[PDB]
């Protein structure tokens, strides 16, 4: 299309939430999503969890899964019939939402409210949302290695990554995961379950002393590492990769402490790099501390440009400047951007929550500023709650195997109350 | 009496506010603009307070507040240009009203409302924060007694010019603490006045020379000699340790062995941005440069802009900055007013600053001017200083070269990597490289 009122750059979780937010407040809105991926907007969490614990051997083709409730759903937010074609977008009665897949915005002209695509096309907009997300980081050791090593290394984020790694797990006998965060630990439990049926091997190495060493306190991180080992995973904590090479066709990971790991494939889950390529041509400011596009409390960068999702470094009126990489955050920030793109002028207020499932026995939700560096107070009874403190106020909460009580945690963070006894606060989560 | 509602609300009654009011009115001929000023005076420009008003021939200059540039007043406009705040929502085609002697003490961004120090509440449709900044003080003078604090002057407002002018006619020794442009301008002003009364003027600062933070050492040293020849006792490399009163006179004890006895002290040691309203308003402050953090359009939130000294903004060409120049307050205020009327345009036109150290020394500058940056100077009495970063000119200082600032502005905008800066110097009519 030559011109479109609402232009959403990127076809991920934040863009879809913004589109349906715009449509809700402007029933006749014409919204164009431009996505470099060939897929329609879809959610990613199932790519490292539900899709691996499915009984259907065609799950790689159907891309459907059963939720905690039990109802089956697809990873796509909506079926193709819910969208309109970009050709019909500036004609169809009552407008709609179109997705232009396989196209990447490569130049942003803020002055003329115009974007240029990788095929030379130019599109003008009235209001634009940057929801480009981010790219998985790689390891310098794997970068210094040859093509043989890189060709046997997976960066997990997209649907293709799930289908390729699922295919690898059925072809090799040993897969090593590098990274102790949520993604690395979830893929370990997933491959561990998948490995128990074929008798294969799953290794996980990371620099910390336990899984989520940057997020959970030491004692809980250590307890988690044992739960992951119970899933059939060989966990190698305190491991820093010095170099990676190929010897006799097998991958050989040399660690800084002298240890060596022989494996067939490597999955690198070592953080995310925000896609801020369009800031150069667009003259958009990026945040040197947190990375990403720097935006205000309303997720706004310029008069008619907002940013949401993983790529948005925003100002939290309550918690300070932040950048968050959570699914619910992309939904909340995307939804908020769409509202502000229709005159709402609302600041980021409703905090988002993140969750993670390390097998069917372990599952944690969380909200706010969750960092192992901050002081923590853990109350337990298999079940517990972790409070994250700063200036004598609770700024982050982790709920360990406690569900359907996130609104309670959200209220504690908002009230900013100075609690004399957190043990009493733990009763709000049914801990006694 | 302030109206309960006003379309445009400008907080602060300084240079940035006035420029925004003119801008708003030029784009919305019926705009109703309310300025709220904690000062009792109408908006006025400050550069004359340290320069032209001291070199005036009129002995009534302290009363008239007029100077020759053509003669004009320090006020941007006479009271006739303004309407009253009470009649602002009734006058046909609106106008600009100034509510003096009132301070905004609370900012509710959610409800687009402010609260004044008297309890008055004013809602707005669009708002500009133009609060400027407060002069800093020295910890040594903060630890001193009331006698010292009573004999210390923080120079910024009209009252400071009138109080210091009367003191220069009553005491024998005035010491200026601060080697920046303000301290140097006041030294040349008091030195010119002291040569006629037989008094003394002292200027001390920690740097090796005047404007040591701005100009290269060789140019800062040359400037210190001209200030000295204006009849000033300049004391470089001076760090104050304590200040006290002895035998009715002020005694300044420096970190080294030197001691200075004087009658009055003038501190020109920088500015502190007035960001008090950021707490209640939930507005972000910049921890590096200070001030309110705003984007390239000077916007903080949907209906709140910030201009002037208090605005930490994003320069698409030069990076995040905060500038404390008169022309910047004009340019950034005019830009804010345009954006408050839908312009949606970024800070693009670079502001210039200038300084006159007597009638024989005149500096003009533009861009990122910092002595820490690598510099290249080309001279012929006159010269140009190029401030470099990434092999590109990011700042220019023009030494006794006038009516060529648009040329300097183009060099910085073009971002060209010049193979020879002597050829670039010829654009300023320079034909000694340092
Ligand atoms: C495997 C996996 C599991 C996860 N599990 C969880 C979980 O359990 N809980 C949780 O809270 N979070 C989870 N997350 C994080 C959550 O998925 C992310 O926060 C969320 O996907 C971010 O959405 P987004 O809109 O910000 O960006 P993205 O989802 O990254 O979407 C951006 C899209 O824009 C495209 N794009 C980028 N640049 C351009 C351009 N110039 N032009 C056009 N298109 C462009 C990108 O290709 C991508 O398609 C998981 C993430 C992954 C990868
Ligand atoms: C003596 C002097 C000489 C100078 N000479 C030069 C020069 O030669 N060249 C040059 O380039 N620059 C010069 N400057 C710098 C230039 O004057 C400043 O950059 C300019 O005045 C900045 O304007 P502003 O509108 O941002 O703020 P200000 O001029 O400080 O105006 C802010 C006003 O808002 C008021 N205010 C603050 N908070 C509130 C509140 N909550 N409610 C109501 N009112 C409030 C303050 O009292 C003040 O009256 C000089 C400055 C001084 C002090
Ligand atoms: N369970 C998760 C919680 C938060 N963030 C995540 C990011 C990734 Cl990439 C994968 C899983 C996550
Ligand atoms: N001549 C000046 C140039 C730039 N900035 C100045 C700031 C002050 Cl406070 C006083 C004079 C100045």
Residue numbers in the entry:
A (entry chain A): 129 to 509, 561 to 611
B (entry chain B): 127 to 195, 199 to 509, 561 to 611, 615 to 617
List sentences quoted exactly from the publication behind this structure:
A 60-kDa FAD-dependent oxidoreductase, AIF allosterically switches between two distinct redox states. NADH binding by the oxidized AIF monomer reduces its FAD cofactor at a centralized active site, allosterically disrupting hydrogen bond networks to release a 50-residue surface loop (C-loop) and stimulate dimerization at the AIF surface. Oxidized NAD+ and reduced FADH– form a long-lived charge-transfer complex (CTC), which stabilizes and maintains the reduced dimeric state of AIF. NADH-activated AIF dimers support import of OXPHOS subunits by CHCHD4 and are critical for mitochondrial function.
To understand how SAXS CX1 and CX2 chemotypes engage AIF and enable dimerization, we crystallized select fragment hits with the W196A dimer-permissive mutant and wild-type AIF. Crystal structures of the W196A mutant bound to CX1 fragments and the underlying 4-aminoquinoline (4AQ) scaffold revealed that these scaffolds localize to the NADH active site, mirroring the native NADH ligand, as do CX1 and CX2 scaffolds bound to the wild-type protein. In all four W196A structures, the CX1 quinoline core aromatically pairs with the AIF FAD cofactor, positioning the primary amine to hydrogen bond with the E314 side-chain carboxylate and the W483 backbone carbonyl. To accommodate this amine interaction, the aromatic side chain of F482 must rotate out of the binding site. In AIF structures with NADH and CX1 fragments, the released H454 imidazole ring is well positioned to aromatically contact and retain the displaced phenylalanine ring of F482, thus allowing access to W483 and E314 contact sites. Halogen substitutions at positions 7 and 8 (fragments C12, D1 and D3) optimally accelerate dimerization. By contrast, the complementary chlorine-substituted analogs D3 and D1 with slower kVR rates do not make analogous halogen-π contacts, presumably from steric restriction of the larger chlorine atom. They still form optimal amine hydrogen bonds with the active site, and the aromatic edge at positions 2 and 3 is aligned to form edge contacts with F482 and H454 aromatic rings. When the AIF(W196A) mutant is co-incubated with CX1 fragments, the oxidized mutant fully dimerizes and remains dimeric throughout the time series, similar to the wild-type AIF–NADH–DMSO control. The ability of the CX1 chemotype to shift the dimer-permissive W196A mutant toward the dimeric state also implicates F482 displacement and H454–F482 pairing in allosterically stabilizing the AIF dimer.
